[PDB]
Design a protein around this ligand. Sequence first.
Ligand SMILES: O=C([O-])c1cc(C2CCCCC2)ccc1O
Ligand SMILES: O=C([O-])c1cc(C2CCCCC2)ccc1O
Lengths: 546, 546
Amino acid sequence: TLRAAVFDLDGVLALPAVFGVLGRTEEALALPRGLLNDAFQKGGPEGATTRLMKGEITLSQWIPLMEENCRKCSETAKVCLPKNFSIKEIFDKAISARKINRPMLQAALMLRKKGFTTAILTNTWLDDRAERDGLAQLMCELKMHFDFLIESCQVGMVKPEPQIYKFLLDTLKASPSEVVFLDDIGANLKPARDLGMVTILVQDTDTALKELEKVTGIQLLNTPAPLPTSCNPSDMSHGYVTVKPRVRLHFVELGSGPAVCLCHGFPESWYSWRYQIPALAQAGYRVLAMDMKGYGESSAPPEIEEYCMEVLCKEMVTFLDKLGLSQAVFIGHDWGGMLVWYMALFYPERVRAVASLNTPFIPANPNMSPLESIKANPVFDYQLYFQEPGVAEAELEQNLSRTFKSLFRASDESVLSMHKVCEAGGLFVNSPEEPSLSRMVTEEEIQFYVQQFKKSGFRGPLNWYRNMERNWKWACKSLGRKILIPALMVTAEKDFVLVPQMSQHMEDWIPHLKRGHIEDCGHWTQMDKPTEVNQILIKWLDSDAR
Amino acid sequence: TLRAAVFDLDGVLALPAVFGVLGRTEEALALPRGLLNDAFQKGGPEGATTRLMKGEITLSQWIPLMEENCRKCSETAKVCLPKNFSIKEIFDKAISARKINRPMLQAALMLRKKGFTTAILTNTWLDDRAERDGLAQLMCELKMHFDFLIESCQVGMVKPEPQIYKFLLDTLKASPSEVVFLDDIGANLKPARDLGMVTILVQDTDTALKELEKVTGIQLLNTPAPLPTSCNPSDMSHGYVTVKPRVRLHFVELGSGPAVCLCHGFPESWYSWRYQIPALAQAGYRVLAMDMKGYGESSAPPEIEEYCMEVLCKEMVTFLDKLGLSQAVFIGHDWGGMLVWYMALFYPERVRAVASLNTPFIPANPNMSPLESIKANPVFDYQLYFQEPGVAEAELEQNLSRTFKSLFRASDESVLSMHKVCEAGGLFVNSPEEPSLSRMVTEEEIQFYVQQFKKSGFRGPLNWYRNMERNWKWACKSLGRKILIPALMVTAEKDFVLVPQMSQHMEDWIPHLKRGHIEDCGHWTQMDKPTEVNQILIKWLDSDAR
Ligand SMILES: O=C([O-])c1cc(C2CCCCC2)ccc1O
Ligand SMILES: O=C([O-])c1cc(C2CCCCC2)ccc1O
């Protein structure tokens, strides 16, 4: 049986192939056929290209040696090289033009999902070009999805030498017949074939993958639309900032650039944004997925007053102040969405841009007590149940697995009531003791929220709802203000509490507000429809927050 | 300076390339990419293909070794070879499908015309397949146009080994930089390049030839329409048959198949058919270009009566009888055209098919003496001048060069009168002593007719015209007959004696007669418009004489 797949970079994982750019430059400049490809391989294992692929010299060092061999080949062919000929400009263009072959990356990912061991085996160089960042950005994005990455310039060997094949085989800890090897170079497959490994000459992606599925007996073509890339909590950078002596806040960091502070709801985690952290970092953002106060690894003080909007927003400001951030894009959901709107109302200097998932901005009524406002709407009866201290904690802290399995469900799958939650005596009263697993989450994803909620419980989480009177008095100070900073409101079609219509009037308060909308999407926006969340957020970030 | 051009066969001189048929068979049978091309090259210099190209085994011996390596590669790739898989059938098809790349052959010919030394350098096999004749027919047709042909299987070496390059260089008697080398195999050019020879990677013919002209500084693309391939009298098979004790006939032989006896006119040679002998042999015919009685190497008896149609046709029959031919296609021109029509009237059993250039069939008038018939038409005054024995001989045998230069001219270039030739006192009376060279002939071609006419003179040639009374009495015996065998009449637009209109009535005598017609064509049909003569004759031969 097969248990390992090997991918070549150029021509297989990334397109177009750099070999083809030599053949393209000969046609553009009308130089004789194969002149550039022959000057590239001059010497064979003794040439400048092999010293480059083996890693003896840098690509900056290599440039003038190729140039010399280009001059040499043109002299022999009895032809002339043009005036503005620059090897650097040709390679700069070819590298920058080269992008990931997405169907190939998805085939790798599908193979690795079925337990296969995956690796990139490439003849590469040590790029010290002033424009090296581009090739580096590319490599990181591919590498992350494979078990190994074998770069010829770091090991000191090259394809087609037999040694690298015995090195990779040793790294894979597998035998030849257990390995599928994909290369666009016919001669680079011959050693792998002579060893007994299954070989695929990659001309077109579709035929290559058709051979790759017939041989694996695993479907790789015509597959359903894949989920965005998620997080393994063990592989993240974990951050901790002390905002006040008794309170510390925890976050997860990924990417470089404009700071994007992610704020989860109830009863959630930094992990709720798991399908958004890799995508948003890939889009050129510094993602900071918070564990809001009362959750995971952030401090959970017992007092109710520690969770009023004024205290929590001062702490988000202190967090910035201590991290050295003058600004942050603030993207919230559910309770974080509320925090995020009040971050914009009270601290616009510190907020670059503001986005909210499901949660709308709705001003305070200086003529109505907030308690009356909750009773007035039947869907908000669960908030009245969360009022008495200890009541919902006892129910939610009873069987954590059951709690998250009963809550984290898609619109149709809903096992919850939410019409006289107070009367019925709880949220899970008519929910099973052993609920089925939702299609939105895995067993492992459920098991992560369980571990997290074992530290502090639901007192802190529920205390965010226990400050309605405090929140109202503070908000009334902002009644004559308008949100005049970039803003994105995202409504979810099947969210039965945070209904799309509840946002209808927001323009009176945020005139330049951008909108988003996800169909057949319930309350758990981020995991229900991650792809759509990603497409909407990246679009608004590039247009409204550079 | 460059003085040698080297052509690879497969992909350069012949298309399509046999390498491509492996890649085509993998797509048709949906076998993995490169499976057949890798099984073909398995072993490298140690494999079955190298032993075949070096010539250690035959291609029949090779077939089951490739089959074994095909089975082996499919096992490693974890795939299955089909039910009706036959390497023999694949190669049989590929060889038979492969034909000459005509623009490449014309580039070779144009280079060799400008004094270049040309040669075919090919990695080939010793073909013992029952269908070997096809590859053999192909090779002969290319080889003939090149100075050398280097077949790897006969020398015992292969491309890319450095030795064959030093062998070819030695055969060419030239140095590296003096040699242009054309190959479709990138690695087969690398040794030739490393040696200092100019290299051309042949992808498409047009770009390959564009490099080949930029480097030679000789025009090869967009050239005018080339002349058909001619004869070098030194390179022909020369034949001699004794018809009667005093008379022997000479001929030139080329090709295999149905016998095609070519009959020249006055004052011509077997050489008049020079542009027809190679073309007609290529078309699958056994060409027999006669030196009719009185010319070149055939016997020239002095008597007039030896040249009457009855004596000459009995001798063409005796020739057949002695050569072992029951039949022959009989193609004549001018006086041979007359002989040819009477060959069909008197000996249809021995004549397969009959074709005439310019000369029409015209029955005898049993009520008018042939002398009166010649006087009756002003264009035939030259025939009256040819009557008195010795008269025209003295004029034509005076300065042979002048005679052939004055006669062998195209329609416009005509320096001859032909209106009262008798009165004026000769054919060349108002023609220069030193006529210019015609565009139809070279100096060397003129010089060949001179050498030939030095042996016997014009007595025998002119004696063909001195039997008008004898010819008439014999022809009157055939007055109630019709020519009911295949027949082709070819008229020439600008022939001022043998006018197209003179043939108008021929259908009364040959009902099923096929016709041909060449525009802006004078009396010297064969050299005036050889290409058109070839196209017409081959067409009629394939349709009417198998
Ligand atoms: O099932 C759902 O889609 C769904 C779930 C909720 C829960 C989130 C806050 C705590 C308890 C209710 C709210 C609205 C919904 O529409
Ligand atoms: O110049 C011509 O094309 C031309 C030449 C001839 C010669 C051939 C037979 C012997 C003498 C005349 C006849 C007709 C022509 O039209």
